Subunit: 409 residues, 2 copies
């Protein structure tokens, strides 16, 4: 996938946007732009409002100015985005017709949504037991273990939806850059992996500090607090509140505290094993290729839909992968999530990943594993034998906040 990052950055054309004007700047030193078509497009959250084609006519090391016909000014809520492509109409010795040489994308304007949720004709039904809390609402039931504190299971009818409960994740299947040159034998105390291990990040014990469930007029509120500890030391504190309403939409709210003295965590999110296994995946966010926070300039914000198969990158040496960023809505099966996060979704748990040495040794698990990240650490790569993730990409704020909405269809 890194290739694309490369292609994007080394492009021969550079674009600037000013008002309704696109400035094209050439970076060729000898040729004129003579096999080049500029394609522009406008869209509202993935929805195409207007397209256009403009032929490029720029002189090596020169500029062009492309004027935009008046642009659609929607009212519906959403993100207005502008996207340009440079296409080569004719083939060449090293490229077929239609080839794409460059692209750029801009966020035109945003329209925040101030619309109130439809009134409901009923409310969830909170139910207590020695073992858990059961909330129902029609055919949908959610169950919350009282000893664990987590949403341990969910139903759509008679059908159970999870294979593993939905819990906080703060680790990752260490990347090559993460490992550096550390070996069982030779341990490099600087590689992030070693720091993570030694800190106990991998073996920390989640503790419930407080579970609570309440019925309110319009909905049911659940509340938790957990702590993760390693050898007497607390590394993280997870404080959440779930809120299920008449519509059957669960609202998750996460608030994380990271001990200042602990190695920056690779991640701050949730994860669970789904029971379902669908064909495609569809999302509204940076895509379609794998992208990380310090590697996603080649990624364009739009509506992607691919086969599950394309969400796992088959690196010869298994580790975290498939991530996609800046996601706003994600659909798999009858589910659907919304917020602002990054995610990955495949048939292999991080564990597996982190234990299999060769991709051919990997075996597909029972359902689909989902990692939903509120924050993810950069992958780096200035070099593979030392820490390379720059500061800006280290989860170091101390306090993280996230919110999700989880619903079906």
């Amino acid at each position: 996938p890194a290739l694309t990052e490369a292609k994007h950055q080394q492009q021969f054309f550079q674009f600037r946007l000013s008002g309704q004007t696109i400035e094209v700047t050439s970076e060729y030193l000898f040729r004129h732009s003579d096999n080049e078509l500029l394609h522009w497009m406008v869209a509202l959250d993935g929805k195409p409002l207007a397209s256009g084609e403009v032929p490029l006519d720029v002189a090596p090391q020169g500029k062009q100015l492309i004027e935009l016909p008046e642009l659609p000014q929607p009212e519906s809520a959403g993100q207005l985005w502008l996207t340009v492509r440079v296409v080569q109409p004719n083939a060449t010795a090293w490229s077929e017709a239609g080839h794409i040489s460059a692209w750029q994308q801009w966020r035109l304007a945003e329209n925040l949504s101030v619309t109130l949720p439809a009134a409901s004709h009923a409310i969830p039904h909170l139910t207590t037991s020695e073992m858990d809390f059961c909330i129902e609402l029609g055919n949908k039931r959610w169950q919350f273990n009282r000893q664990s504190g987590f949403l341990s299971q969910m139903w759509i009818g008679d059908k159970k939806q999870l294979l593993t409960p939905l819990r906080d994740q703060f680790t990752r299947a260490p990347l090559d850059n993460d490992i550096g040159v550390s070996e069982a034998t030779r341990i490099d105390p600087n590689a992030w992996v070693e720091r993570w291990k030694a800190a106990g990040h991998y073996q920390a014990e989640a503790a419930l500090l407080q579970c609570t469930a309440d019925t309110l007029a319009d909905a049911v509120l659940i509340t938790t607090a957990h702590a993760w500890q390693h050898q007497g030391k607390t590394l993280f504190i997870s404080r959440k509140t779930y809120r299920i309403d008449g519509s059957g939409q669960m609202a998750i709210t996460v608030d994380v505290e990271v001990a200042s003295d602990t190695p920056h965590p690779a991640r701050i999110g949730l994860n669970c094993q789904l029971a379902q296994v669908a064909e495609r995946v569809n999302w509204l966010g940076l895509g379609p290729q794998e992208n990380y926070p310090d590697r996603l300039t080649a990624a364009c914000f739009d509506r992607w839909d691919l086969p599950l198969s394309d969400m796992y990158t088959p690196y010869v040496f298994p580790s975290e992968n498939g991530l996609r960023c800046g996601t706003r809505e994600l659909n798999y099966g009858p589910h659907q999530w919304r917020g602002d996060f990054q995610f990955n979704i495949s048939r292999y748990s991080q564990q597996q990943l982190m234990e299999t040495s060769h991709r051919h040794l990997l075996h597909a698990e029972e359902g689909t594993w989902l990692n939903i990240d509120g924050f993810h650490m950069g992958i780096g790569g200035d070099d593979s034998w030392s820490p390379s993730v720059s500061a800006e990409f280290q989860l170091s704020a101390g306090r993280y906040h996230y919110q999700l909405v989880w619903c079906q269809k």
Copy 2:
């Protein structure tokens, strides 16, 4: 501002307030604010703020709340960066400790008036009978930001009725690489899109 929703419920452990407002202008929505107030058996009111800023609006100078206190005390005591006024792009000199000074010293007599006095990375603020807690930045004076921005000389300023309190969970950089063009570096602009901050109001 325009109310979108204002509920209330009694919980086993506390009363829970819940609001949501939208600020508009000429048909556009600049910000959406969402809070949860939660007064407990302790008389401790936890505030939860979650802002949404229209991506096509000029990043805002700040993100917080204000109010005019009816009280007026001699000192101020805080546990944050101090002891001198400090902004996000100008606080390396500041130390994190326990600060106690005269209300007077929390104002900066700049000859030509403006926002001033902010202190950052505060986790505890004490004034009178009240104590705030969290992680935010504040400023405390006898002047309103409105008065400040209306009075062109510092000598024509006058103390308002109580004590105007400003509590920000995020404030913009002051800049000043030059004073004839925007000098505020990107890292110091409030361009995130969504901001969240928590507060806990309590009295003694």
